[PDB]
Amino acid sequence: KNRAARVRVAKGNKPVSYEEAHAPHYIAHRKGWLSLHTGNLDGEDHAAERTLEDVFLRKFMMGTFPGCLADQIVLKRRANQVDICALVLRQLPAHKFYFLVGYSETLLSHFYKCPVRLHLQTVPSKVVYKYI
Amino acid sequence: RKYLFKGKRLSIFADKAFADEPPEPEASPSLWEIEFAKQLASVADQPFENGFEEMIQWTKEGKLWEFPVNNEAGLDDDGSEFHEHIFLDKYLEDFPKQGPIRLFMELVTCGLSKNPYLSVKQKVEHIEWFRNYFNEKRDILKENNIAFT
Amino acid sequence: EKFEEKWNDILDLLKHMVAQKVKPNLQTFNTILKGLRKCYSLGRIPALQILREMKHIGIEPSLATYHHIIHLFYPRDLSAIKMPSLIIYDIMNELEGRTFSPQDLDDGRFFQLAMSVCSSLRDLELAYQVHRLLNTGDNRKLVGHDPLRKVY
Amino acid sequence: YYVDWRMLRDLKRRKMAYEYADERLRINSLRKNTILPKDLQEMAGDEIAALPRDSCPVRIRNRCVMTSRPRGVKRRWRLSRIVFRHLADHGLLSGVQRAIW
Amino acid sequence: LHVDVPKDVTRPTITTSDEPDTLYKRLSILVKAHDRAVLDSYEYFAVLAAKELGISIKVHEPPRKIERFTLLKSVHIFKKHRVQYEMRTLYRCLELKHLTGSTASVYLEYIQRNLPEGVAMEVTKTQIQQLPEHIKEPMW
Ligand SMILES: [Mg+2]
Numbered sequence: 001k002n003r004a005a006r007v008r009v010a011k012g013n014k015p016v017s018y019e020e021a022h023a024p025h026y027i028a029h030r031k032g033w034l035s036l037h038t039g040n041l042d043g044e045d046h047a048a049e050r051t052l053e054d055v056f057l058r059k060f061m062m063g064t065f066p067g068c069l070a071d072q073i074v075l076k077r078r079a080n081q082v083d084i085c086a087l088v089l090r091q092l093p094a095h096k097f098y099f100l101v102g103y104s105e106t107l108l109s110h111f112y113k114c115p116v117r118l119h120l121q122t123v124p125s126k127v128v129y130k131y132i
Numbered sequence: 133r134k135y136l137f138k139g140k141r142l143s144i145f146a147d148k149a150f151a152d153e154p155p156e157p158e159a160s161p162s163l164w165e166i167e168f169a170k171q172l173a174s175v176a177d178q179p180f181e182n183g184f185e186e187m188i189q190w191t192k193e194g195k196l197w198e199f200p201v202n203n204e205a206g207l208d209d210d211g212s213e214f215h216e217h218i219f220l221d222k223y224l225e226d227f228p229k230q231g232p233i234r235l236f237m238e239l240v241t242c243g244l245s246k247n248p249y250l251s252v253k254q255k256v257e258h259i260e261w262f263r264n265y266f267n268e269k270r271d272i273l274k275e276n277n278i279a280f281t
Numbered sequence: 282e283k284f285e286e287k288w289n290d291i292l293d294l295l296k297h298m299v300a301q302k303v304k305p306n307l308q309t310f311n312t313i314l315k316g317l318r319k320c321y322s323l324g325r326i327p328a329l330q331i332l333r334e335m336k337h338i339g340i341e342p343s344l345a346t347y348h349h350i351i352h353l354f355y356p357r358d359l360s361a362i363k364m365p366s367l368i369i370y371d372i373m374n375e376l377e378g379r380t381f382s383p384q385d386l387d388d389g390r391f392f393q394l395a396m397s398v399c400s401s402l403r404d405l406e407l408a409y410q411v412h413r414l415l416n417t418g419d420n421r422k423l424v425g426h427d428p429l430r431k432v433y
Numbered sequence: 434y435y436v437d438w439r440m441l442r443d444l445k446r447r448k449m450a451y452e453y454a455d456e457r458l459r460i461n462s463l464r465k466n467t468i469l470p471k472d473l474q475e476m477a478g479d480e481i482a483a484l485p486r487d488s489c490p491v492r493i494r495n496r497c498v499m500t501s502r503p504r505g506v507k508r509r510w511r512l513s514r515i516v517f518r519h520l521a522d523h524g525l526l527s528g529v530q531r532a533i534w
Numbered sequence: 535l536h537v538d539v540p541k542d543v544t545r546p547t548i549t550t551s552d553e554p555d556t557l558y559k560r561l562s563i564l565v566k567a568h569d570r571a572v573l574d575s576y577e578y579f580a581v582l583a584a585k586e587l588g589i590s591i592k593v594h595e596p597p598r599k600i601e602r603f604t605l606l607k608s609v610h611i612f613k614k615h616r617v618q619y620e621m622r623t624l625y626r627c628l629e630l631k632h633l634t635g636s637t638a639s640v641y642l643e644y645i646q647r648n649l650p651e652g653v654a655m656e657v658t659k660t661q662i663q664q665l666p667e668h669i670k671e672p673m674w
């Protein structure tokens with residue numbers, strides 16, 4: 001049996017999002033890619049550095065927004081610009097988000113020497129694709 | 133009646149037949165002049181109104197790449213020329229004009245001319261290293277009938 | 282104690298600026314007008330003379346320079362509202378279509394003051410001219426800061 | 434802290450080979466030819482041997498940057514097969530999909 | 535905006551120099567992406583943009599490349615059981631013609647600044663110039 005990235009069946013009480021529901025073989029078929037850069041295209045360089053930066057950027061956002069992330073973040077690289085698009089629950093006060101956005105942008109722009117912007121779409125609660 | 137530019141004036145000053153006779157940077161910018169300029173900018177300092185204005189600011193600050201993309205932007209190798217990189221035999225004058233050492237340095241300088249990853253200064257350092265190396269080995273060379281410097 | 286002495290003193294500083302072959306700048310005239318806002322009644326004729334001298338010298342009046350003339354001619358605590366001055370109309374005609382850049386530290390103040398004078402006079406035609414000037418070029422950047430942006 | 438002591442030794446090997454790259458190039462050039470006297474080549478053969486062993490560039494091993502696994506690594510991403518599959522199977526690698534054909 | 539509209543919008547300063555301009559006989563723009571639909575949308579934006587500035591453009595689709603590699607599915611042993619991965623690269627080539635150097639800079643900036651994420655460009659300018667003045671006349 002294959003176990004990779006597969007949320008298993010229980011008794012029909014486990015909420016799963018659209019991203020979680022689909023196993024790896026649905027990548028490029030039903031669900032797209034969370035990161036979009038040019039480093040895995042044919043004849044392109046610096047794939048290892050884009051991949052390492054993404055791993056860190058995901059751990060950073062999880063810790064900086066603990067319990068406030070509704071789904072996995074989406075990373076979009078254009079030129080030297082980095083764009084982080086995160087679905088965030090409406091738990092924290094509004095002014096706290098403005099603090100964490102200013103902090104997380106400045107800190108990650110001085111760490112990777114690129115302009116980094118954070119895009120936050122607030123949801124009332126996690127969106128459930130199906131109950132499995 | 134209350135014409136803004138029709139009527140008597142103070143007349144203490146006279147028409148500026150000579151204008152801006154002393155240069156604006158009479159001295160290097162002082163703290164007084166450097167700080168006044170920062171305040172003038174704040175007078176018109178308003179927040180970004182769209183993504184275009186934000187990108188314009190990043191461009192002025194060097195944060196965002198300039199377009200169209202130039203893969204060699206800001207990358208000048210000491211303002212050198214092609215002839216400096218390609219013709220490197222001028223630096224082999226100290227070496228023997230003929231013989232095995234000349235034959236070897238010919239191969240060394242041929243590779244250096246085809247090296248795009250080194251600057252002219254770095255290439256000269258490779259040549260200088262061999263000059264001092266053979267000088268130290270003068271006694272071994274003399275035994276083999278090779279005379280260096 | 283005496284304004285006439287005080288005014289003649291400030292002028293003496295200006296006369297020594299010509300003896301020493303030192304030419305005045307915009308800030309010099311703006312500083313004189315900002316001081317004159319204290320004496321609303323007696324500063325009217327002196328203030329206009331300065332602006333005429335500013336043009337003859339070749340210094341271009343900035344938004345700050347008008348901000349000071351307005352304060353001096355349209356006092357906020359003006360009991361004599363029966364017959365207000367008409368200078369605001371001439372100023373707006375003078376600046377119609379012109380674009381301005383930061384050249385003084387009171388440029389932002391002008392627009393907030395101009396709208397206030399429009400509300401006092403209850404002239405909506407003048408309010409359109411002031412807002413229309415704000416939209417020409419990049420004049421929007423001199424509307425003012427947080428305190429003066431919301432008042433305008 | 435690096436992943437383990439094996440990754441730490443490799444990092445030092447990579448930083449000492451960079452310092453001795455020009456030196457080991459200039460000396461080794463004197464040996465890889467047939468134009469110079471064999472006495473000089475025999476002496477250059479020992480100058481290169483005398484350099485520290487960690488300067489030698491064949492002692493570098495490519496290890497997964499995240500788990501320090503010596504084998505199973507993919508050189509384009511610098512990750513082991515196990516670590517690569519975790520990022521790929523979750524949609525986190527840009528453009529990597531499963532191969533069905 | 536219904537009633538509140540800018541009056542005299544400020545426009546950048548474009549000063550004509552005295553230096554002669556570059557002349558590009560051809561200008562091939564090879565965009566690459568993992569997604570065909572993105573190339574279709576970008577192709578529409580680029581062809582529409584070229585036609586609006588007077589540039590002559592043609593488009594063709596170079597054959598796609600699929601790079602496949604095999605990995606070991608298990609963490610330990612079970613050699614015969616593998617997992618395979620692929621990366622797909624798709625191409626759209628925009629071949630422009632008869633461009634001056636000013637027209638090629640403004641166009642490339644405009645379309646390069648709007649290059650979607652996950653798309654890589656490969657511009658291949660082809661300049662045409664006279665012969666070197668020394669070569670023009672044989673000198674011994
Ligand atoms: Mg351990």
Ligand SMILES: [Mg+2]
Pocket residue numbers: 491493494
């Ligand atoms: Mg090995």
